[PDB]
Structure formats: structure tokens, C-alpha cells
Design a protein around this ligand. Sequence first.
Ligand SMILES: *[C@@H]1O[C@H](CO)[C@@H](O)[C@H](O)[C@H]1NC(C)=O
Ligand SMILES: *[C@@H]1O[C@H](CO)[C@@H](O)[C@H](O)[C@H]1NC(C)=O
Lengths: 34, 34
Amino acid sequence: QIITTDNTFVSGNCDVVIGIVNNTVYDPLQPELD
Amino acid sequence: QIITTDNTFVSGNCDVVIGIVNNTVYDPLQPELD
Ligand SMILES: *[C@@H]1O[C@H](CO)[C@@H](O)[C@H](O)[C@H]1NC(C)=O
Ligand SMILES: *[C@@H]1O[C@H](CO)[C@@H](O)[C@H](O)[C@H]1NC(C)=O
């Protein structure tokens, strides 16, 4: 699946996780631009 | 319940999916953006 807010949830800042990596997390609302 | 994008997930087109029937699916964002 494409990585977005739909299939992921946030928890804390990034320095507390060992082995964390970076990648885009698209928000479907942005293209809508309602 | 009324079929909406929140309670339904999607995977693939409805050609090879056996028995699929076409029905309206309403996105809650569109009425709010009207
Ligand atoms: C993710 O990006 C932040 C900010 O650009 C950076 O500080 C961090 O090192 C990056 N993490 C990885 C795993 O590349
Ligand atoms: C449902 O059953 C009928 C009667 O056995 C059959 O003609 C039809 O093809 C079946 N539909 C599916 C999608 O299997």
C-alpha cells in the first residue's frame, strides 16, 4: 500500500525509535484542496 | 449504514471481481466542501 495517514498513526518524536527511516506520507486531503 | 469511503476500502477494479454490483458511494468530504 502507498504510505499515507490512512494506514499510519503518529506517536512521539523520531529520535526515540531505533532504526527509524524517512519517507513521504501523503495526505489525501492536500490534493483535494477543499 | 450508508456506504462511504471511511467504512469501505478499495483494491483493484471491478471487472475481474466476481459478482460485484455497481452502487453509489458517497465521500463525506464533498458535501462539507460544497
Ligand atoms: C530524517 O530527516 C531528518 C530531518 O531532515 C533528519 O534529521 C534525520 O536524520 C532523517 N532520518 C534518516 C533516517 O535519514
Ligand atoms: C449464482 O448461482 C446461479 C445459479 O446456480 C448461477 O447461474 C450464477 O452464475 C451464480 N453466480 C455466481 C457469481 O457464481
